[PDB]
Amino acid sequence: STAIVTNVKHFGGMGSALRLSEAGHTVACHDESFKQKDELEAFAETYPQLKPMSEQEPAELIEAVTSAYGQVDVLVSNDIFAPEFQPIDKYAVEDYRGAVEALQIRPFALVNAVASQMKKRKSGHIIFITSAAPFGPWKELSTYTSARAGASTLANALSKELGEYNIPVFAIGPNYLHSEDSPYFYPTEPWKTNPEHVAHVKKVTALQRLGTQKELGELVAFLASGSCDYLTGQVFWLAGGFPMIERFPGMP
């Protein structure tokens, strides 16, 4: 079927996009670097089974994809924003408006653009990649953390209205997901290379490793398959058992 995967080059983008193509889907990909031609074209070259798009705004992209491939069956909102740690008084208020625009407004806008056709066909799936950060927050990341929570709750609240139209809505909240060359949010260096960082991941996850792009993609495809629509409204903590809580002195 026809899927869209945003910000395809970062975070949960490559896992989701490439696993979806393997499921036989046509996969239109959005990204920021695709406002240029060298970039879109190189990507389209490197990935023949993927269709990059230059469209950059939300509703634009939905119409485009619908014109080119007939409709949008699956939306994977892979949202990203650079986390800046700051004590609350040291942020500007625009920094929180930043986070909210990128991590709540964007997914909202997308679904606002695509819902109508899904509802008329009474078919579609919607996946938000959010964050597990609200489940185990670090101090000094209040902008990023809270905006992620808003996104996850959006997914769950949509599941309630869109179930009537046979449309599942999911949020996937990762943490420690290996993002390979992407700085969002766990690049190979340092997160696999430096002992500092390997020792940390090992301590704070029960499985003692980063999540893989392959695991994220497997979930995304299993969900978008129509195999388990009854999980609608789930938020999935794709976090490897994070957090591992420090135990009492004396115990390993």
How is residue 46 written in tokens? 């490197």
**Rounded distance, CA 142 to CA 133, Å?**
10
47 part of the interface to a copy of itself, by CB under 8 A: no
Q: Does 87 bind a copy of itself (CB under 8 A)?
A: yes
CB of 196 to K ion, least distance (A): 32
Across the strands, what pairs with 20? none
Applying CB under 5 A, among 9, 25, 106, 148 the residue interacting with K ion is: 106
| Phi, psi for residue 154 in degrees, rounded to 5 | -60, -50
Number of H helices, E strands in the chain: 9, 7
Identity (one letter) of the amino acid at 21?
A: S
Q: Pattern of binders to K ion over 2-41, x per CB under 5 A?
A: ----x-----------------------------------
Q: Which residue's CB is nearer to Na ion, number 54 or number 86?
A: 86
- Residues 131 and 147: their CA atoms lie apart, in Å, by 10
Nearer to Na ion, 18 or 158 (CB): 158
Which is closer to a copy of itself, CB of 5 or CB of 103?
Answer: 103
To Na ion, the closest distance from the beta carbon of 140 in angstroms equals 5
- From edge to edge, which strands make up the β-sheet containing 235-238? 50-52, 26-29, 2-5, 74-78, 125-129, 169-174, 235-238
- Please, are residues 139 and 208 in contact by the beta-carbon 8 Å criterion? no
Shortest distance, position 31 Cβ to a copy of itself, whole Å? 21
Question: Using omega within 30 degrees of 0 as the cis cutoff, is the peptide bond preceding 243 cis?
Answer: yes
Q: Which listed residue (49, 88, 122, 188) binds a copy of itself by CB under 8 A?
A: 88
Site for a copy of itself in 101-130 (CB under 8 A): 104-105, 108-109, 111-113, 115-116, 119
Considering just the CA atoms, what is the radius of gyration of the chain in Å? Answer: 18
**Which segment (18-26, 44-52, 61-69, 73-81) binds K ion by CB under 5 A?**
73-81
**Shortest spacing between CB 120 and a copy of itself, in angstroms:** 10
Q: Identify any residues that bridge with 98 across adjacent strands, giving them in sequence order.
A: none
Catalog residues that contact Na ion under the rule CB under 5 A: 87, 131, 133, 161
* Residues of this chain that bind K ion (CB under 5 A): 6, 77, 79, 106
